[model samples]
Target: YEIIRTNVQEVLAEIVSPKRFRGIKNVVSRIISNDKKCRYDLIYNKYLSSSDTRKLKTMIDYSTKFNRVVEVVLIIMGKLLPLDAWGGTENKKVIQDRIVDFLRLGANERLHLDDVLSGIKLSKFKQDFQIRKRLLEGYINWVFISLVKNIVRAFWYVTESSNMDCSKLFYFTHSIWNELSSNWITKYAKGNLVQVVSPESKGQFTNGKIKLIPKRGGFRVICVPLKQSLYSFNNKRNFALKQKEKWDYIFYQKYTLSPVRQVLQLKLNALRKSDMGHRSSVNSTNEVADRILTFRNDLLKKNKTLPVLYMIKFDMKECYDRLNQNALKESIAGIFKEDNENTTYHVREYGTLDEFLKLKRVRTLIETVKTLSISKNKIIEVCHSQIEDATCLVKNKEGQYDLFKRKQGVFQGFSLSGIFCDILYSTMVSKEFKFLWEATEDNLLLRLVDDFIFITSNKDTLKKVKDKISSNELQKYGAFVNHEKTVEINGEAGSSNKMTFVGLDINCLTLDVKKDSSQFSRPTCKFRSFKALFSNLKQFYCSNLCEFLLDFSSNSLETIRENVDAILKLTFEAIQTSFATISKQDSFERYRFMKFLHVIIETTIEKFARVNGSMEGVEYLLTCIKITITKSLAFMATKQEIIEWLYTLTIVD
Candidate 1:
């Protein structure tokens, strides 16, 4: 109602000139004359429609007093207000009474009580006040200041005694405390068993002020509404998961420290400290680079004849979402580190009770929770609720609420989710991949949460590790590797080396301390070109492997030419946007142009490495490079020059 009344007042202020309309008669007349223009302007320029404008005008016309026009506007607007905004019966009655009072006062004040009653009862009496064509032409100004004056004024009792003023101050403070206590009591009574604040017992007042909590430190359920995350390809829905929107479940720590949050934080910091001690996690790209160097140094120590380094990088597919609840339950229980009475741990499907209580990290976690004075039942309830009752609230186009519950994965945006994931995956890696950790001489298994990098010198070890992940061994623990995004790098790093990991070149041959630039892949040359070209190609190419490339090339020369032309067109479009603005173009542009050219060629190699059965198509494209060389020969390089240009692109050797 308020929103509608404000909007109408603003719109009228914009359309009607206040200076021209000084009285009720002139204001109404001017508004009616400009009604067509105003309606059209509102409909065209703003979101308002002609029908709505007409309704607003009719509402005013039916109003017997100009002040009643605002009330009618409120009625129209308030009808659509969300029911929750005025949920309680008392609030509903308040709104209803306002509307009824406005409608009853629709008659002009000059009329007698009998005339007002007649106007309310009969249509002819109503028509007497109705706006007409003649009145629409006249200057019917509206001087509307309908603010109801207070009938009874407040009295400030002034007394000469200072004690009286002090007592008054005490009274005011008591009122504030009373209200605050009432609010906290109502909120605390709802759910999640937290401490409630209330006035101290009757005798405990100090100088007429009573303490509410008396002592600090308790708990409360503080479910917070966070901003909605959108999957841009799909509208408001999670298309990938076949789900709707979601929200966060926050436990309030505002009033006092939450034992759950504190214990969880401590466990995480402990885990992080453990990671630093063991070097089990990679903190940054620099650490990864340093690890690679350490691996080379180890190889140098064992044998001077160093074999080519091979790295297998793969990440968990939707790591958080695909988390197996049963495994998570086991891991969480293991944190407790407490033995069950009678050797029986009863939850869901797992090994024997004895085996369950014996798990190291789960026991550790549980031990921490219990040690911190956090209630075990409450902690368990919160965990279970987070997993099972993860719900989301969203608003529809009509501004009504729709709720969605997530059946899988924890909420991604919460602060604790990432930490929980780290704990979960770290537990899995520590237990299952313990072999890789022990084999520091020949192989190194590094993890940054869900991303795993396995660097090795032995082909059998690499294959063995790959098979271990591919098999159901890791699936039992809910760690599934996404094969689609997995990439393999063989040999050293750099353009000469056919291996790249984490956007850095891993060139063992160029391991000289002086050549720091060689340690990293050229972003302008490789990363940007690969991202731009492959991202564009991904839109057109059908298969993960370019399987269709062979089918197209095997066609007649005209058909192949057409396909090549299509690729060339896309390439030109990509180049224009990406390379046209290269600063200091003389050096940068030359480098970029060469890199883009190299990208067109090297991308085939990357595809060959990634896609199965892509070798034939790659060779076929290499064979067709003659066509590119032959076409450019008119003003550019011959076959030899093109070959040399392609050769210069390989810098790692």
Candidate 2:
């Protein structure tokens, strides 16, 4: 069959006259017909070629060896397909020694292989062992160097690679970004603009990159300029400053900014109007929650009859991408309308320029050339430069930039993006919907970036504001509502009982943050050391929960109790989460795990006790300790061992 197909292809190609074709149809037809029969005679009976068999044999051999290498290396890594049958006592020792040798070989910084193989002593083992060692060494090279270090690193490089090179991607997505990025290309790039090459966090750096983040059904495009990371600094520590001069550094005096974005952020915080932007700091979310909670309390008192309210929550569609450049520029222009340096925007309270210069940290930063307290005029200049002159540069892996004009939305992933978005939206809202903006005392408009929730006493008000949210009025401002995400909370069929915003979950009478167990279901880990395992478990499960509980500013007892119980359950569930590859023979890990849990639970109790001082007597802390221990008994080594460890715990005195 192979002989016939190969011969037929050659025979058919024989008609390529080395020149013209069909000069005379009758002459060509008779010549071709005669040629076809003779070619067929050669092909009709042919040789059983030796090369095909040799080539076929070679492929099968290579495939078998490659498959073996992959499976063996994977088993040694102990992540895939656990070889439990290759287990039991003695087999376990053999595999363990094999893994030790593989890892030892990898730890060396040597460039290549006989450096790999030279260390292996010949007289050591059995089973034609030199050949076995040679083969194993090659497998180690393939998996560790060829596969992981080379292949994995390259993939991760491209995955987070700042280079605009799309080695494996959709061209259309890049086009969309190109079109959008073109929206705001500052006219400065058209001038004698020299692009700034940024030096930043990831070691290697470039100026700016427009990226598309894969989202629900499509992609969310964003621009990240790396320069802000380099020249940015922040210090808003509270202190009495340059007046003392000598040691004012002891308490507070700092500088943090590109923050041109950061400076603007500090200014945003300085501006001190909720109407300006909803979230201004990390603490802002909690403040928003607290304010709403208090408002609800007041609202309930006012309407004893039903205590009913309407809650409308929706998100801006493509918030950053769809923003109109004109709107953003207009808003910023209004903020600096009078150009009054006397306006005195401040963050924390390094109020004036001389006061800012007095900051020891600022002086230190300026001296080092790391950062500066750029003057208000300079800051204003830079901001306008970014608006009209900001150029989108795409650095390729090797060279050449694909730059585009940026005229549309504010690019995210910078200090400026947040302030820009907020300023644009806030200014538009006041101008476009002044009456609604002024009515925030009760009919509150809570926004974090594009996420919005309108809380009002009137149930009918939800749909009303929702219409306004999606109306053509906001359409001009580039805040088109994602009607699909628009949710209502009015004790109706489709009404939400709980709404998630930023980090907190808003309930009818409470606010919280909870971890979903489904996300915790796959907790498989591949770690070389038990310490890595503990580190992973501690950070992933307990640390954040402890911080959340410690700093969670809530006044409701019911809310606190619920959050505490949920946190404890999730932490234990995380510790209890099963891994696919832990050795059942390694019983000592169980002891280490239980001890780790003891530290985690005690640490939580200890921190709470220190901070709040009610843990020793209150049922909250003591009961929490007892419940953890009691539930932990199912996993602990023995009562005596558990009893011994629990004593060191500094809980309940």
Candidate 3:
């Protein structure tokens, strides 16, 4: 940057007026000014770009990195280079030399003979063919040799050796390509494997122990490792082999170690080995428990029962917004020992490259490991103070920051909030209430994260759980479950019989009074249902064809059972009319009736799927109706002809 500025200033002095040049003291001012700038370019071109080419070229060699610029210049050079029309070895050498000089600068690995040069019928090429092929082969060899240098360096770093070893590069050759299993690879479609396997399965295994013989033509699961020699080493007989070869689909990406192995803690904005001290969020569950304990003890003089309290329970729900940072920090500070100061927190983010090749906007994250140095004794003083008071801080040394208080049964609001929504999926559990926990992305378990369905049998225990959650100590920093979203499903005298929170709808009062039955089910008015479906459909078709016509109020879920009989009756009536009109006709008569009937049903279903978010029942109906509609449409009419027919459907009832 300085070099460009200094040179620009020196050249400006010769062309500009003496007084004006003297006035322009700052180089940046002259660059910004409009005076004599473009003309100075002409002066420099007359002298520097042409007149003093030899001296200027020497100066360029000293100052500029030409090897880097060679890459940029090569795009222009491609237009300059001509393809060899005849097999002249000289023409081949020119192209090869250019490539070789460029590759020598940086980067490992070049195109291979098999990949780039294979399948060429060199009999037509003569001498140039051999020259071109040789040049490419030389580049391939050089790439491997350069990579060998790095491999040796890596091995020496691993083993602390002074001498580079040829065996270092052997590691790359000996390693097999890593294989992976993924959901996408196991596509969700069914097919039979018997025919393919029958031709090859003669005496391959002993004692008739063929592991996976085909049964029916359904979902075909390919024999993954069995198809390739890649996992041949894994075929040895052992108990562990069975576990390793278990059939389960999984999403897998290849794993690799970082080129530079550095343990990073982005929250502290420092490397892990740095002198920075560790930090834990103030509102973390362990910190909360400490606050609760202190609050209880401090208020114990007015009430002794609070100090000996056990079985801490919570009624948390959708609480990411419930946190009051100011109050939380104050609460943590009160519980903190005198030595533990400045333990508050703020949020920051780091940018990451996204899939679209754009730098994604900063992602929100928590940063709160307040540490300066080990010599400060910040964490030790706090721990010693707790031990002095006969209290133990919960810890799980192996767990992540959020789960660090696992032994003490403390959970943080920030950590568990997202997992609470999608409930009761896997049976995976931790210390307590494992069976009851459930979550989706935006949902969470009630006590631990979001709302829950609380079921208790003992009255005394129920009271204790409710009190802990609603207590002044806990509610001061965060919100308890909103009573509107919480309900008593069933309850005994002291303990909870059943209680639901956050839209479980496990109550008679708010239960959906709707009937869901298959359209294909046997009905008293199957004919009539069809008649009504066609009549209403036809009326809507003619009056407002090509527009949607679903009525939410009359055709809601609740009326489906009582209304379906009439709908089926109407559908059959329409079919009867169409059948009568086509009776004394050719074999194509049956096709026409089926075709017209299908259009009515197909259009209705397409509308339903568009309105609903792929409701399973509606989707099924839409699919069945579409098949029938397609059969009818293909039998006689085009899209426009059927649409025009629908446009005239009225007064058929």
On TM-score, the candidate that comes out on top is 2
Model 1: lDDT equals: 0.40
Candidate 1 C-alpha lDDT tens digits along 294-351: 8778888897757776767888876765677667766666555563413322211111
Candidate 2, RMSD to the unseen true structure: 20.4
* Quality of model 2 by C-alpha lDDT: 0.44
* Model 1 poorest ten-residue lDDT run: 148-157
Order the candidate numbers by TM-score, best to worst. 2, 1, 3
Give the Cα error of residue 511 in candidate 1, in Å: 7.0
Which has the better lDDT: candidate 1, or candidate 3?
Answer: 1
Q: Which ten residues in a row have the lowest lDDT in candidate 2?
A: 152-161
Q: What TM-scores do the predictions have?
A: 0.37, 0.47, 0.19
Which ranking of candidates, highest lDDT first?
2, 1, 3
For each of the candidates, the C-alpha root-mean-square deviation to the true structure, in angstroms, is 28.6, 20.4, 31.6
* lDDT by residue (tens digit), candidate 3, 512-595: 122233222232222223333333344323222211123221122222222322343444444445543433342333434344
The list of candidate 1 runs beyond 4 A from truth reads 1-251, 255-262, 268-279, 283-286, 297-306, 338-378, 395-400, 492-500, 508-653
